[PDB]
Amino acid sequence: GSLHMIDYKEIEVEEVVGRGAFGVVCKAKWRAKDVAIKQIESESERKAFIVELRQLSRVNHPNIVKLYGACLNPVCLVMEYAEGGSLYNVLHGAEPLPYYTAAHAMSWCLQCSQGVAYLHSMQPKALIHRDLKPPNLLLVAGGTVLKICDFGTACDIMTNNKGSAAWMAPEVFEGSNYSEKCDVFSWGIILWEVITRRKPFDEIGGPAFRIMWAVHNGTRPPLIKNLPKPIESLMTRCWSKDPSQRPSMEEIVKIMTHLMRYFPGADEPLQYPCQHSLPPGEDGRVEPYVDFAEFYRLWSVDHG
């Protein structure tokens, strides 16, 4: 790709917005444009920096963060500023939590799958994200647009134990020959998480090896009460122990694109508060946070 060798005299830092998977992300203003500058925090983060610079220059997609340029002394990346913060803060963050509809849960998953499909379509070698999880998915335009970030783990299609235990494919930690179908497993977990508004494997106590043993032995998140059968089949196909039994990310884009007919209003910004910070009863099945009543209504209009 093509990056700008920006000097520190051209970038104006406003505040520290937090730390991502690696480095320190700071709010900044460069050439009448709001940018995010990820700087080196420790000398150990130089491998992840070279990798993210190498991969981010190749990518160009609306559902993936835009890398404007990079600096040399000291080395830092200058990407676009994601106004709405991370999806993890929207779902499980500090109060007040924002209200979101079933259209938002599906739109975010569609945009995530669209982004991952562009990475998996890369030539001559596909680009696997390996760390697909809500802390790495940012929101912009009133929380209506999702953008995948943190490509420090990303690699060309291996190295085992990449990501966070709750959204990690079982073959990744098993020391098996994993493929781009490991991102598909993560997507299925993210789908469950945005529909229920629950952190996957919260009941299974830490450390990560406890979740790894559970997922490795077939344990998946609880089934969702009243979840539409088309969505339930897509979600549990992504959770398959066999990665070849999981659908391709391009098939997920086609399927989610088609379901969006029954999920209108995804372009409405998140502006209402949410005091329904209530974790209901666990009895093998969980209640969805979102409501599928409007889906069933629109589906009946087309299918008898």
Ligand X SMILES: NC(=O)c1cccc(-c2cc(-c3cc4cc[nH]c4nc3O[C@H]3CC[C@@H](O)CC3)on2)n1
Is there a binding annotation on residue 185? no
CB of 264 to ligand X, least distance (A): 28
CB of 77 to ligand X, least distance (A): 8
Closest CB to ligand X among residues 98, 288: 98
Is there a binding annotation on residue 38? yes
Q: Which of 34, 131, 183, 242 is catalytic?
A: 131
Closest CB to ligand X among residues 88, 299: 88
Closest CB to ligand X among residues 25, 252: 25
Is there a binding annotation on residue 147? no
CB of 149 to ligand X, least distance (A): 4
The burial class, CB within 10 Å (0-12 / 13-18 / 19+), for 143 is buried
Closest CB to ligand X among residues 37, 169: 37
Is there a binding annotation on residue 22? yes
Q: Are strands 67-70 and 4-5 parallel, antiparallel or unpaired?
A: parallel
Is there a binding annotation on residue 20? yes
CB of 236 to ligand X, least distance (A): 29
Closest CB to ligand X among residues 150, 180: 150
CB of 89 to ligand X, least distance (A): 6
131 part of the active site:
yes
Is there a binding annotation on residue 25? yes
Residues near ligand X (CB under 6 A) are 17-18, 20, 25, 36, 38, 65, 79, 81-82, 85-86, 138, 149-150
Annotated binding site: 17-25, 38
Annotated binding site for ATP: 17-25, 38
User: Catalytic positions, please?
Assistant: 131
